[PDB]
């Protein structure tokens, strides 16, 4: 593997996904294909769709090989079914040789491929124990690292609010400057994370640390927002509104109902708080208000929305940070992205160490 | 899960050995099924997978043509067949399916 021919091996279509070239079978076939750290199959369409230009043709692959069963998939808002296969795949970005892989081809799906959207397949990078049909269904990655010799870490980039980086089996120098947070993965199925707090413009949202948590909180490069538990999704709504200088938002601006438009420093950063592996300390990430104030007269987005399950660190949080999967350390790293800048002004933060003896040792419920 | 490895042990350079894995706690007839070897201060080294159904194999460039993979999925075992071994062969031999791996059989040529 080659890392640095890794370096914007993504394509993101602005708020749509990012996106890596992947070539299946023999001879080969380029699909585009969403990077998703929530998810742990890899996923592509198999027949014609309205919202796609083109799908894998299993019959035009003369190493494809039938399972001879299906899987089907169930989303909240979606979801498909497909014939399981085999075969082989090469990721032109970064490797020069074909991996043997498990492939779901898609034949039916509800409100999956949606129109305007650039991909036409799914690579999940989470654990096995998400897999479907069975966590038995070797996953892409699992593959890959094996077959390929490479460590079992990957990491990401999102260039969007300034394309992107999936390094696959480590860590890219040149993705980042300053130092590297790490903060221990606490269940291995999506990448679950244990938050400790949330701060809005310096000031605390005073709830129980078992509210970031109480489902579970994950980084998903699969979701577009900063998904948050209704109540907690309400304290920092109420915050941002005591803290932004302009007079008021409107109600439907904070659901997504409404756009608020114009023609900054009057919008408070957004800090969330992470275990460090010494768990006496914390780290804190922070988006500045252009990661979560999303441009769409210039009008604007809310880039939070709530949840009625998870605390999901999405594509809102994950474009100001270059993001470390380290399975092999059982840690998710962070590191400020340099490319998350916007008009010359830095849009996310990293600092550290902070003391945790105000919370307690496990936020996440038992 | 379970995997389980055997054939090994020590063999002079030009010898062979048939390496065995037995499978339990999953639907073997269904698995990709992959062969890794490690020794001590080197680093892992894949050495050849195989789909479900045996006609699929891919090997890695330091084993073509002295080491063939295969599988018996009615009796739940993987193979290979190592022919031609050098002493930088020497390894612990390990199957690995789904992010599981067995134990190993290790694997020594030497004169």
């Known amino acids: 593997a080659n890392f640095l021919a890794m370096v914007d091996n993504l394509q993101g279509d602005s708020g749509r996904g990012y996106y890596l070239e992947m070539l299946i079978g023999t001879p080969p076939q380029k699909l585009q294909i969403l990077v998703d750290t929530g998810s742990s199959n890899f996923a592509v369409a198999g027949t014609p769709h309205s919202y796609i230009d083109t799908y894998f043709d299993t019959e035009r692959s003369s190493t494809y090989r039938s399972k001879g069963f299906d899987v089907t998939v169930k989303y909240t808002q979606g979801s498909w079914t497909g014939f399981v296969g085999e075969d082989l795949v090469t990721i032109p970005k970064g490797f020069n040789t074909s991996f043997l892989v498990n492939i779901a081809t898609i034949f039916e799906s509800e409100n999956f491929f949606l129109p305007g959207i650039k991909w036409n397949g799914i690579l999940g990078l989470a654990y096995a124990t998400l897999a479907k049909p069975s966590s038995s269904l070797e996953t892409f990655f699992d593959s890959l690292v094996t077959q390929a010799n490479i460590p079992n870490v990957f990491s990401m980039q999102m260039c969007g609010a300034g394309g992107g980086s999936l390094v696959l089996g480590g860590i890219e120098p040149s993705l980042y400057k300053g130092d590297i947070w790490y903060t221990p993965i606490k269940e291995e199925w999506y990448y679950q994370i244990e938050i400790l707090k949330l701060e809005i413009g310096g000031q605390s949202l005073n709830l129980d640390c078992r509210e970031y948590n109480a489902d579970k909180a994950i980084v998903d490069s699969g979701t577009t927002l900063l998904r948050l538990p209704q109540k907690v999704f309400d304290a920092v709504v109420e915050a941002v509104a005591r803290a932004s200088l302009i007079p008021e938002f409107s109600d439907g601006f904070w659901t997504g109902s409404q756009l608020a438009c114009w023609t900054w420093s009057y919008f408070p950063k957004i800090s969330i708080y992470l275990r460090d592996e010494n768990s006496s300390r914390s780290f804190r990430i922070t988006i500045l208000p252009q990661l979560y104030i999303q441009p769409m007269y210039e009008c604007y987005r809310f880039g939070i929305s709530p949840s009625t399950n998870a605390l999901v660190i999405g594509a809102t949080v994950m474009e100001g940070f270059y993001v470390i999967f380290d399975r092999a350390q059982k840690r998710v790293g962070f590191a400020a992205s340099p490319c998350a800048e916007i008009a010359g002004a830095a849009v996310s933060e990293i600092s550290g160490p902070f003391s945790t003896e105000d919370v307690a040792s496990n936020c996440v419920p038992a | 899960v379970q995997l389980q490895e055997s054939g090994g042990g020590l063999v002079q350079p030009g010898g062979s050995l048939r390496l065995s894995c037995a499978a339990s706690?999953?639907?073997?007839?269904?698995?990709?099924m992959t062969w890794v070897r490690q020794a001590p201060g080197k680093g892992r080294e894949w050495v050849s997978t195989i789909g479900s159904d045996g006609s699929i194999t891919t090997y890695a460039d330091s084993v073509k043509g002295r080491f063939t993979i295969s599988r018996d999925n009615a009796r739940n075992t993987l193979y290979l067949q190592m022919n031609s071994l050098k002493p930088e062969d020497t390894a612990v031999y390990y199957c690995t399916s789904a992010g599981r791996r067995g134990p190993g059989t290790q694997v020594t040529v030497s004169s």
């Open positions: 706690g999953f639907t073997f007839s269904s698995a990709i």
